[PDB]
Structures are given as structure tokens and as C-alpha cells.
Structure 1
């Protein structure tokens, strides 16, 4: 039961720019995803103040970074608010439209790709290092879904029958062949310390079994 959707033309152009532009400072993708995780965790924490049952799906508010050399994936997991099917398919891409236009304008005026987060479209920076991105998400008001895209103007959404998450979002980065440094413990620690040292949630960098 896999549905295929076209990105809005502005998002497809943003993704092509990220993939095509020569830009060496790719490490910023991690700061952007951790920032998105922190925002989602802030959202559930805020909502839980007026409705404590919103934490019945899990009280722990944290971020896990999980590298896997065998699958060549780097996963960023949070126990934030999560996304409904409507968030995944339409609402978040609608918001992203204006941010995309402002960003592309800022770039033509002298800005650089690392400033993507100032335009609210930081998730797409995942395409600096990933040939494919899989997003597993679970919001309190909906079922678990798997979103996926290798760019090229489309994405898919399916209900996810994999390991249940409770609540939150898991961004799985299927890394490009030449971007395996992002699976290295020393490299991830360096990036987190440089760009994400003040995030208000524990960040656990998992290590590899082999």
C-alpha cells in the first residue's frame, strides 16, 4: 500500500540546488536535523503542560544518533511530537514553500547553503550527504508512517508495519558512497560539539558493535 506524490515544484528545485551546488561544508546537515528534533521535542513538552496524557506514548525527551556501517546509514531519532500523515504529505511542504523562495533569493544575493535553517527548510540539507532519506514518524493523533525519497521530484508514504516507535521521528540517512565519514564516532562527536553543544535534550551517540 505505497502512495507516490510529487513534491511542489519549489521543493523539487530546492532539492536539486542542494544536490547540484558545489559546497564543501556538508557537515551542517547534522546541526539542521538535531535542530528539527529539538523543535519537535519543545512542541511535545509545551503541549504536555496543559495535557499530561500527551506523554502516555513516552515521557523521555531525547535524541539518539545511530550510525550503522553495514547498512551505510546514519539515523537521527527523537521522541518529539512526531508527524501525522497530513503533516508528512501536505502541511509541512506548504509551510516550506515561502522559506524555499526566501532562501533561493538569499543565495542569489550572497548567502550560502549553511544558512538554510534560517528559512525553516533545514530538513532538505539531509540531501547534502544522503542519496535516499527514510523518515519514520508517529504522532499521538495518527498511526506510524514511513516517508521516503531519493529526490528526482517524488516521495512515497506508506503505513509503517516495522518496529513501533511510541512517539517521535526517525530520519534515516542512506549515505552517499563518498560521505561515510558521517558514520565515524570521532567525526560525529566533533560535529555535535561544534554546532549542537547547547541543545536542551540529551544527545546519545551510539557506537558500533563491530
Structure 2
């Protein structure tokens, strides 16, 4: 019965990243499906990192040996979750990688979009994670690194994000991205569509990808 207390840290995004987010959110783009390719590619990069780091430190895998990616659509709560057993991120990694630090690609990318370039180019500018906002109104990133506790990052955009120690289900190690889909983007919860886009854009990821249906 005692009330629980939870500490939260709210951070403002870096100015151009915030501009980029408004651009992605309030502009119509037709090839939205590449958001999934970008997430799986981020997961593949993180899996590569724990993989190589373990060659020289097998203990690094005590937090989990499987190196893979799971996709979990949930039609009830309208979320598409992408989980990987990659190296994860510490709290500081989270805060720096997801918002507070300027990326040199942002401006060039925003200018390129203003010129009508395809949103698919986004990964080439180092800000592919933000493509999640093409289909999600809110994004929650839960991550666990061997050197730190499990944290949850969350943002509905609007210029800021929060970080807090995660009270949710523990992960051994890795990063889980939960996309709360916009209502007109529920196609990405359909198994056929997900298989279609993973086959089209991610046929070559070198880690198993498993789609869990129901």
C-alpha cells in the first residue's frame, strides 16, 4: 500500500534533432516502411558489437548467448516491438545517442528532404532511428548494458524525452524498441506486411530475425 516513488530525468532534444523530428512527424512521406529496416540495422550494429567484444571476453555473454532480433506486433495495445540481444546502452549512451548530442548529418538530411529526397536516405545520414516517428506517435526504448542497470527512454516528440530506471520486465542484455503506432499505421502489425518489408529491406542481416504472431 505505500506509494512508490520513481525518479525521472527529462531532457530537451538537440535543436536540429527536434527540428528533424517535427519535419518527420508533420510532413507526409510515402515510403514509411523503411523505419523497420532502420531499426533492424541498428540492432544488427549492436549485435556485431557484443559479438566481437565477446571473442575477447566470453564473460560478456553471461548476460545471454543468443544473438538475435525478435519482432513482436501487438494488435491489442497497437505496438510493434523490436528486441535485440545486442550490446545494449548504458544510461549515458542512451542520453547521448538518443537526442542530446548533435549529429553532423541532421542539417544535410533536413535540407535533402525539403528538396524531396526519399525518407529512405535517412539511414545514410546517421539519424535513421528517427524514422520510427514516421509510423509511431510515441517511442519507448528500453535497454540493458552489461555495465549498467536497465533504463527506459521515451518520447512522443514535442521537443523532449525522459529517461528513468526501468521497472519493467528485465532483459538480460540488449535493446527493445516499442513503437506505439499511429492509428492510420496499423498495417505494420500485420504478419504479411512485416515479412514483406523484412524480406524487401533486410534480407541480408546476419543474425536470426524471428517474428512472433498472436
TM-score by length of 2: 0.93
CA contact (8 A) 1:138 1:145 kept: yes
Q: 1:2 aligns with which of 4, 8, 12?
A: 8
Matched residues, number = 208
CA contact (8 A) 1:96 1:121 kept: no
Cα distance in 1, alignment partners of residues 130 and 67 from structure 2: 24
TM-score by length of 1: 0.95
CA contact (8 A) 1:81 1:139 kept: yes
Q: Could you tell me how far 1:108 is from its partner in structure 2?
A: 4.2
Unpaired stretches in structure 1, ≥5 consecutive residues: none
Tell me how large the CA RMSD over aligned residues is.
Answer: 1.4
Unpaired stretches in structure 2, ≥5 consecutive residues: 1-6
Q: Could you tell me how far 1:109 is from its partner in structure 2?
A: 5.0
Cα distance in 1, alignment partners of residues 110 and 167 from structure 2: 38
CA contact (8 A) 2:139 2:156 kept: yes
Q: Could you tell me how far 1:126 is from its partner in structure 2?
A: 0.1
Note the alpha carbon deviations across 1:30-67, whole angstroms, 9 max, x for none. Answer: 00000000000011101111111111100100000000
Q: Could you tell me how far 1:113 is from its partner in structure 2?
A: 1.1
Note the alpha carbon deviations across 1:150-203, whole angstroms, 9 max, x for none. Answer: 000010001012111010000000000000000001110101110001110000
Cα distance in 1, alignment partners of residues 101 and 46 from structure 2: 16
After TM superposition, which residue ranges in structure 1, 4 or more long, deviate above 6 angstroms? none
Distance 1:18 1:149, change over 3 A: same
